[PDB]
């Protein structure tokens, strides 16, 4: 979105990253590698699930008949009661429309934040020998084929596997 567009991220569909919504690409001699992150997704799915649950809690008074207003005697009251029913139904409908739209604006926007997080996960595990572009990308001092890239998506990557420095916790 607006962030990615400005700060030169790629409006890149990577078809083939299938196990997930977000992950990594990888680039060089081997061509291009693609991996999804099975956490950034579960995470994105969790948020949405909880949002569904929140959208579902809202309770609103039943909206029934006037017990004392009679069908042929009190039609002018009965009309005003219809108007009331209608307006209620319209007001709460509009509110729900507003709640959900906000929900969607969030969910959709959250996207680039995942990307931004995914990148910090990468920065760490690539080590200090790597170079952070700003792109969302890292220039590395070693090759990264599909197997390499998959160890990243798992978080089982180690710089040093290609003898290069490491941050350890």
């Amino acid at each position: 979105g607006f962030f990615g567009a400005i700060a030169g991220f790629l409006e890149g569909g990577w078809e083939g990253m299938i196990a997930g919504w977000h992950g990594y690409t990888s680039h060089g001699a081997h061509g291009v590698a693609v991996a999804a992150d099975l956490k950034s997704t579960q995470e994105a799915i969790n948020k949405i699930t909880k949002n569904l649950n929140s959208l579902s809690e809202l309770e609103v008074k039943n909206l029934q008949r006037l017990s004392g207003a009679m069908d042929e005697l009190h039609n002018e009251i009965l009309e005003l009661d219809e108007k009331v029913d209608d307006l209620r139904a319209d007001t709460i409908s509009s509110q729900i429309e507003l709640a959900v739209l906000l929900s969607n604006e969030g969910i959709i926007n959250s996207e680039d934040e995942h990307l931004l997080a995914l990148e910090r996960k990468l920065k760490k595990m690539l080590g200090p020998s790597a170079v952070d572009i700003g792109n969302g990308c890292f220039e590395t001092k070693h090759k990264c084929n599909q197997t390499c890239l998959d160890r990243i998506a798992a978080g089982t990557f180690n710089a040093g596997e290609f003898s290069l420095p490491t941050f350890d916790s």
């Binding site: 979105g1 790629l10 409006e11 890149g12 569909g13 990577w14 078809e15 990253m17 299938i18 919504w21 977000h22 990594y24 690409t25 990888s26 680039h27 291009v32 999804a36 799915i45 949405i48 949002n51 569904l52 959208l55 579902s56 609103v60 039943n62 909206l63 008949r65 017990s67 004392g68 009679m70 069908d71 042929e72 029913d85 139904a89 319209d90 709460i92 409908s93 509009s94 729900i96 429309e97 959900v100 739209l101 906000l102 969607n104 604006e105 959709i108 996207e111 990307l115 931004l116 995914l118 990148e119 690539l126 969302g136 990308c137 890292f138 220039e139 590395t140 070693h142 990264c144 890239l149």
Partner: protein
Amino acid sequence: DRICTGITSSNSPHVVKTATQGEVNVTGVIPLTTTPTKSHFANLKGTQTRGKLCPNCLNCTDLDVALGRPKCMGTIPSAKASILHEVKPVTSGCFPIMHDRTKIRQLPNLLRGYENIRLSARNVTNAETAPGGPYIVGTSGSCPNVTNGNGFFATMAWAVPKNKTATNPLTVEVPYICTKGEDQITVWGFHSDDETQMVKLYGDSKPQKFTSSANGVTTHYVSQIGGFPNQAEDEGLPQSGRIVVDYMVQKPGKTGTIAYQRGVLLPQKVWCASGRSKVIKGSLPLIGEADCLHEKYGGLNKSKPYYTGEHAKAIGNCPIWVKTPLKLANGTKYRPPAKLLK
């Protein structure tokens, strides 16, 4: 070598409405709407349902029961949910009424309004000691009995006066009567007949005036003598006459006043009713169970939080009505697949 963060490209047919980015295409969606489909009415779960003021009052109308006809005197209880199947309810026998002249038809539908209602634990107004002379508690064939005697609406007394003489308006004072702060629904009316039968039954063959007062609600009538309209919602041929019948609602602690003359169907057994029941225009051979009773759609059960379609009164665990189908983004904004890379 370059490792980068990326998002997917995939089939994204579902479109979602957003604030900053207009309408956007999305990987997947969780629908929150449904258009329910018309089904039969059921019994709201956590609450009890009414669609026949009485179940143990057999082959009858609700109006019949309301009016206090002989057989239809089944002791009727409580529901906190009541369906209104009779918008203009009918009678199914007894003495021919000229219904369309009073608010009486809706008596059942007013009753329905309450959680608790009862036949009556007594009968106000001593039909014999009633103002005016002594009356014979007029009885009548055309309203069978438990044995086939002379039926007349437990509701009211057919005040036929021994000493048939003309009367200047007399005033009964219908008292409160009811247990606790129940509402009271008084019922009453007037018989009228033809030239000859009028003089025979009471001492006067002229139009008879009637006037009730109750909680600032005044009503005034003038009996008809000749040419009554065809008999209907009745049975078998006392077609010399008809009873114009009406009800009167006495709120807790309050007194009613009926000014009357001749033909006076005096009140007798008077409803006591209280509690509020949630009512809805239902149409019922009531089958089974639903979560929610929609005036349209009918018996319905709660799948998704909102529903699209026809708004209408609805009670129970109901989905909230919504202008338009709504979907919750469960995925990613569409991106075209990439080779715009180098």
